Amino acid sequence: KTSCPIKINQFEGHFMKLQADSNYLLSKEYEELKDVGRNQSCDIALLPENRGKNRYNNILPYDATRVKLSGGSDYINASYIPGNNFRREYIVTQGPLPGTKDDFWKMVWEQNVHNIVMVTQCVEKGRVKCDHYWPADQDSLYYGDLILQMLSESVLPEWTIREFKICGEEQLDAHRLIRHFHYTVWPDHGVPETTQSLIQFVRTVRDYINRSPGAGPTVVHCSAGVGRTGTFIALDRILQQLDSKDSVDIYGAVHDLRLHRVHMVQTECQYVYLHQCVRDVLRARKLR
Numbered sequence: 187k188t189s190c191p192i193k194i195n196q197f198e199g200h201f202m203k204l205q206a207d208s209n210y211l212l213s214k215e216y217e218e219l220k221d222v223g224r225n226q227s228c229d230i231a232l233l234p235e236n237r238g239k240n241r242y243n244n245i246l247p248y249d250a251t252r253v254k255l256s257g258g259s260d261y262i263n264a265s266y267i268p269g270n271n272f273r274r275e276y277i278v279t280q281g282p283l284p285g286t287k288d289d290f291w292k293m294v295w296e297q298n299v300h301n302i303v304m305v306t307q308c309v310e311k312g313r314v315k316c317d318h319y320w321p322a323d324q325d326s327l328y329y330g331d332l333i334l335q336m337l338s339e340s341v342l343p344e345w346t347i348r349e350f351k352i353c354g355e356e357q358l359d360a361h362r363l364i365r366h367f368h369y370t371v372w373p374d375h376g377v378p379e380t381t382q383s384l385i386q387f388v389r390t391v392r393d394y395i396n397r398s399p400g401a402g403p404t405v406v407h408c409s410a411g412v413g414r415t416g417t418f419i420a421l422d423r424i425l426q427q428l429d430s431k432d433s434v435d436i437y438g439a440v441h442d443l444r445l446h447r448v449h450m451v452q453t454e455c456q457y458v459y460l461h462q463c464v465r466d467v468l469r470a471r472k473l474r
């Protein structure tokens with residue numbers, strides 16, 4: 187299986203069948219995804235000199251899809267995800283470490299990123315999951331050769347939107363505005379409390395992207411840059427399918443992400459959640 191399309195008019199019943207006998211068919215599907223993509227090298231990532239640049243030593247970018255930094259140490263734990271129409275729709279990455287904050291912002295600048303989506307908290311169940319890689323207050327900071335200033339921070343019920351200005355130090359006139367969307371209510375290895383919340387967050391970000399008169403790739407990260415990051419991007423793609431086609435292909439969406447990075451949609455619960463979001467959108471639409 188590379189794809190399992192479901193006609194939208196059949197989705198409700200198909201989902202009930204997938205859930206039958208304690209999610210038997212859903213589990214069978216999820217398990218079929220287990221080895222997708224795994225026939226690719228993680229060689230550059232496994233170099234001793236790059237070891238300390240990886241948050242989790244099992245979660246490494248493939249050579250064929252890794253993002254390269256300019257200059258003499260080109261390594262960051264980050265992977266390009268191609269779009270349906272053109273390469274590099276997203277860059278998926280881990281939560282930056284103290285020693286990779288500069289690399290993260292260097293990647294942002296070099297790849298012409300204008301929007302960042304963060305789907306982890308910095309600290310969860312008492313563990314650091316992502317370092318606090320932007321300024322704490324309103325003062326400018328250098329991160330390597332870039333200057334970063336926070337312009338606004340808008341705390342909303344379930345996510346916070348921040349705007350930053352970033353300048354290359356050699357050309358202070360040529361700044362860029364970066365928007366950062368931080369979803370604050372998603373437990374690691376788990377799912378948000380409602381489908382409605384993540385659906386609206388994804389639609390919100392998608393609307394902002396669509397007004398970012400084409401930017402570069404959207405960066406999406408969590409702690410490892412696979413579970414919550416993968417579920418987010420999967421839901422973005424699936425919601426676009428529901429707006430364009432009369433079939434939806436959740437298996438194909440996750441399959442295609444796994445071709446580009448390990449563990450995208452990292453738990454069966456997350457895979458089930460994607461089905462619940464589709465179910466919920468379609469239920470509403472049936473009556474409207």
Ligand SMILES: CCOC(=O)C(CCNC(=O)OC(C)(C)C)(Cc1ccc(NS(=O)(=O)O)cc1)C(=O)OCC
Nearest residue numbers: 242243244374375408409410411412413414415449452
């Ligand atoms: C380096 C080895 O680490 C792993 O294998 C991780 C983390 C395991 N640790 C963990 O969950 O700790 C607490 C339960 C106390 C929070 C690496 C990891 C960490 C977080 C995620 N979620 S994501 O941030 O949503 O990607 C995914 C993988 C793992 O579970 O791998 C699964 C393939």
Ligand SMILES: [Cl-]
Nearest residue numbers: 266268273274
């Ligand atoms: Cl790509």
Ligand SMILES: [Cl-]
Nearest residue numbers: 269270271272
């Ligand atoms: Cl695209």
Ligand SMILES: [Mg+2]
Nearest residue numbers: 259285286289
């Ligand atoms: Mg370095």
Ligand SMILES: [Mg+2]
Nearest residue numbers: 288328329330
């Ligand atoms: Mg520094």
